[PDB]
Amino acid sequence: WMPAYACQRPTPLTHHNTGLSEALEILAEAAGFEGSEGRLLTFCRAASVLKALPSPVTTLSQLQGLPHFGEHSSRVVQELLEHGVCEEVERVRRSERYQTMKLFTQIFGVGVKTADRWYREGLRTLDDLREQPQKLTQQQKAGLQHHQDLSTPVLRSDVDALQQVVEEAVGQALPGATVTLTGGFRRGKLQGHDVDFLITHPKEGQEAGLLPRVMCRLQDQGLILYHQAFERSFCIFRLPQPGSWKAVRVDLVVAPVSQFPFALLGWTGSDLFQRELRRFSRKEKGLWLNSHGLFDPEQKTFFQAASEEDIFRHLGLEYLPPEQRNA
DNA sequence: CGGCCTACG
DNA sequence: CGTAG
DNA sequence: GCCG
Ligand SMILES: [Mn+2]
Ligand SMILES: [Mn+2]
Ligand SMILES: [Mn+2]
Ligand SMILES: [Mn+2]
Ligand SMILES: [Mn+2]
Ligand SMILES: [Mn+2]
Ligand SMILES: [Mn+2]
Ligand SMILES: [Mn+2]
Ligand SMILES: [Mn+2]
Numbered sequence: 001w002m003p004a005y006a007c008q009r010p011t012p013l014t015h016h017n018t019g020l021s022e023a024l025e026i027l028a029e030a031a032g033f034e035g036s037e038g039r040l041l042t043f044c045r046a047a048s049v050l051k052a053l054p055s056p057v058t059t060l061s062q063l064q065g066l067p068h069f070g071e072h073s074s075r076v077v078q079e080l081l082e083h084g085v086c087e088e089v090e091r092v093r094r095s096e097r098y099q100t101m102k103l104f105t106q107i108f109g110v111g112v113k114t115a116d117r118w119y120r121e122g123l124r125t126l127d128d129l130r131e132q133p134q135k136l137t138q139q140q141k142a143g144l145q146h147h148q149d150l151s152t153p154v155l156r157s158d159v160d161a162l163q164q165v166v167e168e169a170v171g172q173a174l175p176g177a178t179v180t181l182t183g184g185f186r187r188g189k190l191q192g193h194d195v196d197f198l199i200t201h202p203k204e205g206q207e208a209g210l211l212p213r214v215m216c217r218l219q220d221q222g223l224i225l226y227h228q229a230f231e232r233s234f235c236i237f238r239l240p241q242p243g244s245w246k247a248v249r250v251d252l253v254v255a256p257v258s259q260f261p262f263a264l265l266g267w268t269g270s271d272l273f274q275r276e277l278r279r280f281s282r283k284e285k286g287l288w289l290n291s292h293g294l295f296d297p298e299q300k301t302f303f304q305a306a307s308e309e310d311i312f313r314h315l316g317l318e319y320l321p322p323e324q325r326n327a
Numbered sequence: 328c329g330g331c332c333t334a335c336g
Numbered sequence: 337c338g339t340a341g
Numbered sequence: 342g343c344c345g
Contacts, residue, residue, distance in 0.1 A: 041331055042342035234339055269341040278332040290333050
């Protein structure tokens with residue numbers, strides 16, 4: 001019944017098994033902190049299966065036959081159903097290691113390997129890092145400086161204001177260029193950790209050199225707190241608010257129009273949906289997918305797509321709109 | 328046994 | 337390494 | 342951790 005790849009099934013934003021999926025996602029995050037991407041992926045995939053089910057799981061029997069449920073994930077669910085808590089999950093939650101790794105990796109510019117080195121050196125708080133600025137890259141310094149604002153959910157009103165100023169700068173940089181909201185907001189999320197935008201021009205090649213021109217125009221309007229030929233810019237914007245301002249993470253991506261459906265698909269996510277789609281493409285169809293194209297390595301040709309629908313069709317998949325890609 | 332997405336900055 | 341979805 |  002339930003397909004094994006997340007790209008083969010609809011996953012809505014609101015689902016019926018949050019308690020169970022949240023517990024499995026804690027274990028997935030902890031697996032990542034200990035350097036096991038494989039265990040992280042299994043726990044994420046198991047959590048995602050539960051998000052696609054039509055009803056609450058109330059009895060362990062309802063897991064039988066589900067993909068990515070084996071002995072470990074099933075026992076977590078059984079303990080949650082039988083007792084309301086999973087001892088392993090609670091032990092991870094309360095551990096100093098998990099809490100500190102979560103704190104550090106949430107900083108823009110810090111991943112697991114950096115966080116783990118700092119943990120091993122005895123560092124535990126954001127003030128600990130601030131007291132040792134020479135150990136920070138420029139990106140990390142920006143992430144730490146703006147950490148409180150970046151921990152505030154981004155709202156739709158923020159998205160709408162940012163889209164206007166990005167459209168203004170893009171139109172000043174290149175007439176006819178377009179701006180498309182991507183990321184979680186395109187999947188219907190009401191909040192986010194950032195705003196993602198994809199920029200193109202209908203005439204192939206006209207977008208060459210665009211992103212530096214857009215960045216210069218935003219900087220001159222005082223809108224940029226942090227950035228840095230390029231085609232992806234992971235920015236922090238100074239977003240005006242009533243009487244003040246707040247820092248907001250914004251990702252700006254430029255693609256030629258030939259690549260636009262592939263970039264739109266990749267940048268709309270979810271992260272797990274796209275990893276699963278790329279895995280499906282290669283392992284089941286023999287085709288190589290990324291945000292630039294879909295390559296047949298035996299004919300040595302790229303699939304020409306005019307839409308996301310075209311890509312799903314070439315992969316033999318039922319089309320899913322963005323709001324059903326919340327894997 | 329090994330794979331686990333696949334790029335850019 | 338970091339970033340992205 | 343699960344699976345091809
Ligand atoms: Mn439902
Ligand atoms: Mn186990
Ligand atoms: Mn028990
Ligand atoms: Mn980080
Ligand atoms: Mn986003
Ligand atoms: Mn490129
Ligand atoms: Mn093995
Ligand atoms: Mn993301
Ligand atoms: Mn293992």
